Amino acid sequence: GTNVNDKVHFSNIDIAIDKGHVNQTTGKTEFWATSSDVLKLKANYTIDDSVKEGDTFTFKYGQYFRPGSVRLPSQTQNLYNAQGNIIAKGIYDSTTNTTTYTFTNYVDQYTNVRGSFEQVAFAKRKNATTDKTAYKMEVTLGNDTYSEEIIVDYGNKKAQPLISSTNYINNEDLSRNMTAYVNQPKNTYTKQTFVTNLTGYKFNPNAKNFKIYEVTDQNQFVDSFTPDTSKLKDVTDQFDVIYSNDNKTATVDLMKGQTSSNKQYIIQQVAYPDNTDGKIDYTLDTDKTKYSWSNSYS
């Protein structure tokens, strides 16, 4: 059918943080994206009677805002009435950050259609990069625009030689796509052995998704743990990733080719659930100490 963005009217648009965390100094509520918070998009809507099956409308999400959670959004996004009948079937496209909805025959069977929705949403981590920074969360529902600034904190700890986080959970296979940051403080080491141990997941050695990048600018370390890899220096082939424990352990000597190094690394990985969907533990063995970071998951 035809684009009926001008016939679908959204009001009381809101973006909330659930649950939200307090900044311990300033007392403002913030989006702590690695401490269980999500965003919630809400709105009321009315649909004009001139709407028919096959007509379409869009949700356009801005550069810092997207549907979904830590887990990437489904391509399927439906608009349901209060009893669970499908008013419209939608297709989310991550390339355009837009959902395109198509009305069902529901609108041909009912008039004066009015309701409301709630949707779990998140930061677009690639663009909303930096701790304690306010980002503009923007959506356009039909032709109705809304923007609100949200303060994000991912909890990067830049003084840590080793820190890791979930970049995203894959919606289709539930793989944990991980980011680890090695040597943010730019210390100098003669030993630098990087180990990941999985509980409840496995690596796939042949999937070619264990990537090692050599940081050339400190700002490539984005607090969001979703770096733009197309601009990083890919040095994966210069290292030997060694698997063991039935592909549940990967060990890498980051000192390879050197006796002393102040190099800094971003490492990305894919850990596939064994079956539910576990623990991922990292260690970095150095001259003086063994650093640890764990991420734990229900």
Residues between 251 and 280 with contacts to a second copy, criterion CB under 8 A: 275-276
Distance CA 232, CA 49 (A): 52
CB 204 within 8 A of CB 210: no
Whole-number minimum distance, CB 251 to a second copy, in Å? 16
- For residue 208, what are its two tokens? 């070619």
- Locus of tokens 């290292």: 239
Question: Which lies closer to a second copy via its Cβ, residue 6 or residue 14?
Answer: 14
Whole-number minimum distance, CB 88 to a second copy, in Å? 9
**Does 50 engage in binding with a second copy (CB under 8 A)?**
no
Q: Which of 5, 164, 196, 226 binds a second copy (CB under 8 A)?
A: 226
List, as one string, the DSSP characters of 242-267: EEETTTTEEEEETTTT-SSB---EEE
Q: Which of 219, 240, 246, 259 binds a second copy (CB under 8 A)?
A: 219
Name residues contacting a second copy, limited to 20-39 (CB under 8 A): 20-29, 35
Whole-number minimum distance, CB 253 to a second copy, in Å? 19
Name residues contacting a second copy, limited to 83-122 (CB under 8 A): 83-84, 87, 89-91, 93-95, 97, 100, 102, 105-106, 108-120
**Does 238 engage in binding with a second copy (CB under 8 A)?**
no
Q: Is the peptide bond before 19 cis (omega within 30 degrees of 0)?
A: yes
Q: Which of 208, 240, 246, 259 binds a second copy (CB under 8 A)?
A: 208
CB 71 within 8 A of CB 125: no
Distance CA 93, CA 75 (A): 7
